[PDB]
């Protein structure tokens, strides 16, 4: 769906923060205990060219830490998660030093499982980054969007 061209996996490595997120269905992010309300923390590239991901998400009245592996495919900036439903991740854009934009969908239902996020290197609000995020979203069927504050980023599961 018009994603970034070639991506330098080696440079997206390091710490990140989930500044803002959006989804095609409200239920996807509505309520903190959402199925797609995840928070990226670390991106660790593997030797085989894959990308390990350290993240947090609500699960039965408790924030849980999880390590996911997005396997690179025969498509530029598109990886795949071996988890059920076959969630696909697409890197829309990134400057490597400040922001990164991606979306994730489940092949099973590529209509009611499209979530996108705007990541950043420092726990600050990057207005210009959000800008590119809003711009890249005006063409998607998002029916819910959230944006966080520096203080909210201080929470494993965001205040």
């Amino acid at each position, epitope marked *: 769906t018009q994603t970034m061209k070639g991506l330098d996996i080696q440079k997206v490595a390091g710490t990140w*923060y989930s500044l803002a997120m959006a989804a095609s269905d409200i239920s996807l992010l509505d309520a903190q205990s959402a199925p797609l309300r995840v928070y990226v923390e*670390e991106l660790k590239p593997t030797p085989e060219g894959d990308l390990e991901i350290l993240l947090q998400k609500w699960e039965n009245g408790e924030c849980a*830490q999880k*390590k996911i592996i997005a396997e690179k495919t025969k498509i530029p900036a598109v990886f795949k998660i071996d988890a059920l439903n076959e969630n696909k991740v697409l890197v829309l854009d990134t400057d490597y030093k400040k922001y990164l934009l991606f979306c994730m969908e489940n092949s099973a239902e590529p209509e009611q499982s499209l979530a996108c996020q705007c990541l950043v290197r*420092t*726990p600050e609000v990057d207005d210009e980054a959000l800008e590119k995020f809003d711009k890249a979203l005006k063409a998607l069927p998002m029916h819910i969007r959230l944006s966080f504050n520096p203080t909210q*980023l*201080e929470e494993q599961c965001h205040i």
Partner: antibody
Amino acid sequence: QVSLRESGGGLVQPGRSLRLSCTASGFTFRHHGMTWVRQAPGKGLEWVASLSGSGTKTHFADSVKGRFTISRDNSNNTLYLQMDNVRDEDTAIYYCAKAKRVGATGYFDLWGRGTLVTVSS
Amino acid sequence: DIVMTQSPSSLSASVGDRVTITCRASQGISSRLAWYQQKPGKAPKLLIYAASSLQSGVPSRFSGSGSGTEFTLTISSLQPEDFATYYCQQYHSYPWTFGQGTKLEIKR
């Protein structure tokens, strides 16, 4: 340039109170959660209290809650620890540690040498 | 309170062999475990976090693995300066707990 220097430690009498301060440098202080870890003479590490980057979120250990108060000053890059009504069990080397993220992350990539607090009469 | 038990408490290995320290939690703690290194009168150093993520500036010979309840810190090419006390710490729930620690001296 990145380092953590704690100070304030010394001899303190049972029941009295002392203030420990930790000076940071080489990184952006408000962007990291800070924590205090201590070590009693010839004993293992023990987590004391934690604080987020903003400092609006703090956490203490039961053995010190109500007596110790953690605080931070994002202007002078200083991390504080207020020890009130000190018991003998508080004798230890108080270490200053920096969290990887803005919140009390749980793991700390930067530590200081620590300051020895001896509570006796 | 989650109780972290390290093992062995002390070890002696010749510079060069690979060493392995184990750490077990009193309950599942996901992959939220870290490994610190502390030397006499020096500032502890973070080696591993998230069970297997290697802190920047730490030699690749240090590795970490494990999940659920059992975790392990491995040191490949043991060096003469790898001598120290290693501690594991969990951050799944409060209070955050440390392991009694493992003291590693260099065989010589």
